[PDB]
Design a protein around this ligand. Sequence first.
Ligand SMILES: *[C@@H]1O[C@H](CO)[C@@H](O[C@@H]2O[C@H](CO)[C@@H](O)[C@H](O)[C@H]2NC(C)=O)[C@H](O)[C@H]1NC(C)=O
Ligand SMILES: *[C@@H]1O[C@H](CO)[C@@H](O[C@@H]2O[C@H](CO)[C@@H](O)[C@H](O)[C@H]2NC(C)=O)[C@H](O)[C@H]1NC(C)=O
Ligand SMILES: *[C@@H]1O[C@H](CO)[C@@H](O[C@@H]2O[C@H](CO)[C@@H](O)[C@H](O)[C@H]2NC(C)=O)[C@H](O)[C@H]1NC(C)=O
Ligand SMILES: *[C@@H]1O[C@H](CO)[C@@H](O[C@@H]2O[C@H](CO)[C@@H](O)[C@H](O)[C@H]2NC(C)=O)[C@H](O)[C@H]1NC(C)=O
Ligand SMILES: *[C@@H]1O[C@H](CO)[C@@H](O)[C@H](O)[C@H]1NC(C)=O
Ligand SMILES: *[C@@H]1O[C@H](CO)[C@@H](O)[C@H](O)[C@H]1NC(C)=O
Ligand SMILES: *[C@@H]1O[C@H](CO)[C@@H](O)[C@H](O)[C@H]1NC(C)=O
Ligand SMILES: *[C@@H]1O[C@H](CO)[C@@H](O)[C@H](O)[C@H]1NC(C)=O
Ligand SMILES: *[C@@H]1O[C@H](CO)[C@@H](O)[C@H](O)[C@H]1NC(C)=O
Ligand SMILES: *[C@@H]1O[C@H](CO)[C@@H](O)[C@H](O)[C@H]1NC(C)=O
Lengths: 274, 216, 198, 39
Amino acid sequence: DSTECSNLLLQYGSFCTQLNRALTGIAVEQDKNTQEVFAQVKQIYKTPPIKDFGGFNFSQILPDPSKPSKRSFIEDLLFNKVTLAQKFNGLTVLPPLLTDEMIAQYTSALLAGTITSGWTFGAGAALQIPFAMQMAYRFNGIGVTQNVLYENQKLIANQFNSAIGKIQDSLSSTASALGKLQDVVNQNAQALNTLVKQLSSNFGAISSVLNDILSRLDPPEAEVQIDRLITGRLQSLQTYVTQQLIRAAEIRASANLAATKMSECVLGQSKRVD
Amino acid sequence: LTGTGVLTESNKKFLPFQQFGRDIADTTDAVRDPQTLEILDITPCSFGGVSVITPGTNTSNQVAVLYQDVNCTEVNVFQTRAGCLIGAEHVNNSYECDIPIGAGICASYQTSQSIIAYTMSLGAENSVAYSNNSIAIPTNFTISVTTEILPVSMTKTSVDCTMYICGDSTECSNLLLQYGSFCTQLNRALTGIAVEQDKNTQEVFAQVKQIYKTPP
Amino acid sequence: SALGKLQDVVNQNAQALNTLVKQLSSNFGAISSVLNDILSRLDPPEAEVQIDRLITGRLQSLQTYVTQQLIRAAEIRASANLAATKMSECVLGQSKRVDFCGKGYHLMSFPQSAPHGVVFLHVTYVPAQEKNFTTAPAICHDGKAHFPREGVFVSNGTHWFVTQRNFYEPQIITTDNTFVSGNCDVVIGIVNNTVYDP
Amino acid sequence: KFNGLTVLPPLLTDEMIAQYTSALLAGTITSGWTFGAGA
Ligand SMILES: *[C@@H]1O[C@H](CO)[C@@H](O[C@@H]2O[C@H](CO)[C@@H](O)[C@H](O)[C@H]2NC(C)=O)[C@H](O)[C@H]1NC(C)=O
Ligand SMILES: *[C@@H]1O[C@H](CO)[C@@H](O[C@@H]2O[C@H](CO)[C@@H](O)[C@H](O)[C@H]2NC(C)=O)[C@H](O)[C@H]1NC(C)=O
Ligand SMILES: *[C@@H]1O[C@H](CO)[C@@H](O[C@@H]2O[C@H](CO)[C@@H](O)[C@H](O)[C@H]2NC(C)=O)[C@H](O)[C@H]1NC(C)=O
Ligand SMILES: *[C@@H]1O[C@H](CO)[C@@H](O[C@@H]2O[C@H](CO)[C@@H](O)[C@H](O)[C@H]2NC(C)=O)[C@H](O)[C@H]1NC(C)=O
Ligand SMILES: *[C@@H]1O[C@H](CO)[C@@H](O)[C@H](O)[C@H]1NC(C)=O
Ligand SMILES: *[C@@H]1O[C@H](CO)[C@@H](O)[C@H](O)[C@H]1NC(C)=O
Ligand SMILES: *[C@@H]1O[C@H](CO)[C@@H](O)[C@H](O)[C@H]1NC(C)=O
Ligand SMILES: *[C@@H]1O[C@H](CO)[C@@H](O)[C@H](O)[C@H]1NC(C)=O
Ligand SMILES: *[C@@H]1O[C@H](CO)[C@@H](O)[C@H](O)[C@H]1NC(C)=O
Ligand SMILES: *[C@@H]1O[C@H](CO)[C@@H](O)[C@H](O)[C@H]1NC(C)=O
């Protein structure tokens, strides 16, 4: 809100477009990460209404129709474990392309394809197969004869159900497991907070308000007093942009690792140790 | 205390003896009217970037703009969750995403020869015929060939300090050296980049001890 | 438009160089954008002041360009490492990692060079046409339980066969395709049929 | 190359890259994966 400050500002060349271009690239990359990680299934499969899976119980991970959103129980527990736009300077936030409902639909299609088809849905088209035989195939993968499973099916089913109960109890009880997903929010909130706080620095002038200076001095010294503020705010913006670039690179590396894990661990069986 | 914003009656604030209120930054948030003593809230006027949904000029020259994060009751006018869009018509159908917009809304050019804004569809619905004693076994195959292109090395470059900052001017070079070594610390980084640009190609391609040759 | 990945690098490099060169045409608060004008019109005491502000502007521009180049080079190296890994694994051998050397079951790949990049031609195996059958975990013959050595038990409505899992190729059940493991009152879903002996 | 900025030429020319990809393609076709381990 200053028609005279922007006239001295435009004397600094194209320092105003580089930051916008970099931030736009960051935004595009951050949406491409999610699009690449989740959108790995061509179609949208769904589980049959009858849950006859050889004794295994997947009710705690399948979507819950009774909920307002088509989320699972563990997903609902996860969304309540993460806490935390209100700024009103030239700072805006944009909504992601894919809403949480679409992500839930993707992870439901992936999970319902994994249960029914196994790994065949990742190569060609989904091929139905009983779960009690898919699990024998998976034990045959790790050099254990399938008669071990076929003679102990109830034991493995009970152990899997107990493990699911234990994991749900652990998620519902302890809240410190999601620190990795909490820091990615805290660091950005703190960076925006510092950027906003930088607006209240003298930087060498007599006051940190443009309207205060323009209503008290003459232009020949008003421009001198405005130059320091312009320099300080430009330096703050540049530092913020550089930090954002580095953090975005780190997040992209993490997203690539997640995409590799989804491609290998989920859509197949991995012989890579640990 | 000049400025700009939207005045609003704020009975929530109290200010028993305080004249003004303020926020994290040096921006006032509440003031009291000197004539009649009540507390007024100050909220800045709405603002936001402008985006232009457009098909290629090869096809046509029809556009539709979008003011994101603007409740344009003030400004065919639509209203989405990512802002508000004028110039395109809402459609109850759902197709793939052609021009992404946001919050699950995508735009595309139909035929009518107009621009439509719909909600994207994730994929064709499918449901496997799962059963506890049923299998599906392939009887035929197909061989497919896929392309995958990825870069290896960028363009090596190097710059000169004085020749750029103080080109052919002795009194400029007589002031530049007062800053110490801000020159060599840039050329060193550029040289490192140039060296790794060759290391990348050497790693990617040089993986054979001998040069093999196909029979005639 | 298939080679956008390689074109983007050139486009960004050209844009960065163009912006750096065009940054020389800004006053940065000085009277003129060419120092020759200043040194030929004003006395030293403020000519040096203008020179100093020009120097600060140009030095800041160079620092910004160098930082951007460093970040882009780091990203390019990160991509080149993946390219080298693909060349080592998909080409020089056969990879069992799912969706690493192309969709489907990987067979072999062929490398091709490109301006500032590489291109792989992954050859993959994909099943095409499917059928329906009726399986069974095992089979009783004389109170025992025969399991497939490798493959599945399938039935076309009347007869039972043993076939490989990735291709339909029925064979008569025998003692060379199955192995015995105990009695068959424990397995769930077992259906009993005759087993031929050579 | 007008204001003290230069571009250096790559160490590996475009012909040696082609020679590498020809050696790789000819080893792959005629030897399988055995050419990567030993001889
Ligand atoms: C799968 O597990 C769920 C939850 O562990 C089971 O649902 C419970 O069913 C009992 C009755 O048997 C109820 O008393 C509980 O309130 C249910 N819990 C929930 C969260 O709904 C379900 O029965 C199990 N299904 C199978 C086939 O084992
Ligand atoms: C397996 O699929 C291939 C095609 O992928 C079939 O080959 C085709 O057979 C038809 C005969 O009706 C010919 O007209 C085509 O020219 C063939 N295509 C090619 C590329 O050769 C093959 O017949 C199928 N095999 C079975 C047993 O169904
Ligand atoms: C299931 O497969 C069996 C074995 O191939 C079929 O039995 C043979 O069917 C052919 C018909 O093409 C006859 O010529 C043979 O004499 C049959 N052999 C025996 C031992 O019966 C059987 O017909 C198939 N059933 C169905 C419904 O397709
Ligand atoms: C496997 O074959 C045996 C016969 O050898 C079948 O056993 C019969 O089962 C019925 C009903 O369960 C009984 O009434 C008979 O007394 C059983 N006979 C014998 C000799 O045990 C058995 O049904 C067959 N398996 C299946 C799945 O049908
Ligand atoms: C003083 O302020 C009150 C506010 O209600 C106003 O009514 C009054 O006219 C003011 N005094 C004078 C002299 O204008
Ligand atoms: C672009 O225009 C050319 C003619 O100028 C036309 O041949 C071509 O099909 C157009 N491409 C698209 C994608 O519309
Ligand atoms: C937009 O403004 C209208 C009236 O101005 C109001 O009824 C509506 O609730 C507002 N919606 C949002 C999302 O601000
Ligand atoms: C979409 O459908 C709803 C109800 O099904 C209807 O109220 C609305 O007018 C429809 N929109 C269009 C553009 O036809
Ligand atoms: C197998 O049966 C299901 C339902 O009975 C059907 O949808 C599917 O198309 C069948 N498979 C083939 C290959 O026709
Ligand atoms: C398969 O399910 C049917 C009911 O849908 C049931 O009658 C049959 O016993 C089941 N078979 C096995 C092996 O569990």
